[PDB]
């Protein structure tokens, strides 16, 4: 039961993550950018009730905080089902347009896999839960991602914003990927034999013997939990010779 050996490493028992070694991120704007404030589109009580719990939880976790900002983007009530539960999706497109571009350093899955040697048949796959939220946003950049929120009967003043790298921000994947690479550089050095593939929040650890893939996995989980990241114990694929990774099925140095 790896779940018991490494409590801090699993989202199930380690609590929300926070990459303690990473300095809060500063988001540079384009040279000519000025704040854009888009009024919130009227939302139905149904959508609001559906979204409320999520907002409340984020506030209690400190991921969302009240604020007053010249920036504002609309919240979209998206129901994953065909007519069930909602989830808040923020339309950060006008903000993305005003933020300075950075080089896309995340390798496409195909090329990433080309780094998998035939010798390592034992793989481990971990998915980091709420990856972006583990990265802090510098207070000077937080106002950029503000949106409107209310409760027709008592509630928050008006706007809330993120204290962590938000979903929907064009640079979140790249910044997370680069941050985790910095945090796992030492681990790679301490395990010259192991093969560690990273695709934003999806990790594939490779090894020759179940002993390696096993001892290596223990070190990774311990390392991850220690750095402040959290993996999904639910979806975790430990020391297998066949696993699903990035939409592929790895089985015998194949796919």
Partner DNA sequence: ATTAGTTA
Partner DNA sequence: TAACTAAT
Q: Is 81 annotated as a binding residue?
A: no
If one asks whether residue 171 binds DNA (CB under 7 A), the answer comes out as no
If one asks whether residue 44 binds DNA (CB under 7 A), the answer comes out as no
Number of shown-chain residues binding DNA (CB under 7 A): 11
How near is the Cβ of 5 to DNA at its closest, in Å? 36
CA neighbor of 80 nearest in space, from 104, 100, 59, 54: 54
Residues in 22-41 that interact with DNA by CB under 7 A: 41
Q: Is 173 annotated as a binding residue?
A: yes
> Is the CB of 93 or the CB of 138 nearer to DNA?
93
Q: Is 91 annotated as a binding residue?
A: yes
If one asks whether residue 59 binds DNA (CB under 7 A), the answer comes out as no
Among 3, 23, 78, 102, binds DNA (CB under 7 A): 78
> Is the CB of 85 or the CB of 193 nearer to DNA?
85
Q: Is 177 annotated as a binding residue?
A: no
Q: Is 202 annotated as a binding residue?
A: yes
Q: Is 143 annotated as a binding residue?
A: no
* Binding region for DNA (CB under 7 A) out of 53-61, 88-96, 180-188, 236-244: 88-96
Contacts of 186 (CB under 8 A, 6+ apart): none
- Describe the strand order of the beta sheet including 147-148 as a list of residue ranges: 64-67, 159-162, 147-148
How near is the Cβ of 77 to DNA at its closest, in Å? 9
Residues in contact with DNA, shown as a per-residue x/- string from 89 to 128 under the rule CB under 7 A: xxxxx--x--------------------------------
**d(Cα 224, Cα 230) in Å, to the nearest integer?**
7
**Binding-site residues from annotation:** 41, 91, 93, 107, 127, 171, 173, 201-202
Q: Which residues bind DNA (CB under 7 A)?
A: 41, 74, 76, 78, 89-93, 96, 168
């Amino acid at each position: 039961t790896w779940l018991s050996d490494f409590p801090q490493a699993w989202a199930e028992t380690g609590g929300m993550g926070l990459a303690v070694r990473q300095a809060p991120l500063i988001i540079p704007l384009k040279a000519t950018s000025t704040p854009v404030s888009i009024k919130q589109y009227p939302m139905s009580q149904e959508a609001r009730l559906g979204i409320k719990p999520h907002i409340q939880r984020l506030l209690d976790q400190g991921i969302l905080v009240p604020c007053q900002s010249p920036w504002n983007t609309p919240l979209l009530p998206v129901k994953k089902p065909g007519t069930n539960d909602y989830r808040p999706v923020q339309d950060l497109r006008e903000v993305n347009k005003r933020v300075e571009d950075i080089h896309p350093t995340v390798p496409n899955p195909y090329n990433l896999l080309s780094g998998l040697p035939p010798s390592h048949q034992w793989y481990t796959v971990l998915d980091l839960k709420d990856a972006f939220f583990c990265l802090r946003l510098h207070p000077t950049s937080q106002p950029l991602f503000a949106f409107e929120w209310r409760d027709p009967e008592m509630g928050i003043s008006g706007q809330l914003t993120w204290t962590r790298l938000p979903q929907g921000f064009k640079n979140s994947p790249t910044l997370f990927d680069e941050a985790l690479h910095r945090d796992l550089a030492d681990f790679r050095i301490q395990h010259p034999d192991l093969i560690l593939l990273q695709y934003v929040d999806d990790l594939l650890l490779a090894a020759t013997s179940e002993l390696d893939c096993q001892q290596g996995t223990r070190a990774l989980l311990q390392t991850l939990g220690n750095l402040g990241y959290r993996a999904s114990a639910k979806k975790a694929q430990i020391c297998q010779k066949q696993v699903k990774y990035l939409g592929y099925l790895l089985k015998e140095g194949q796919r």
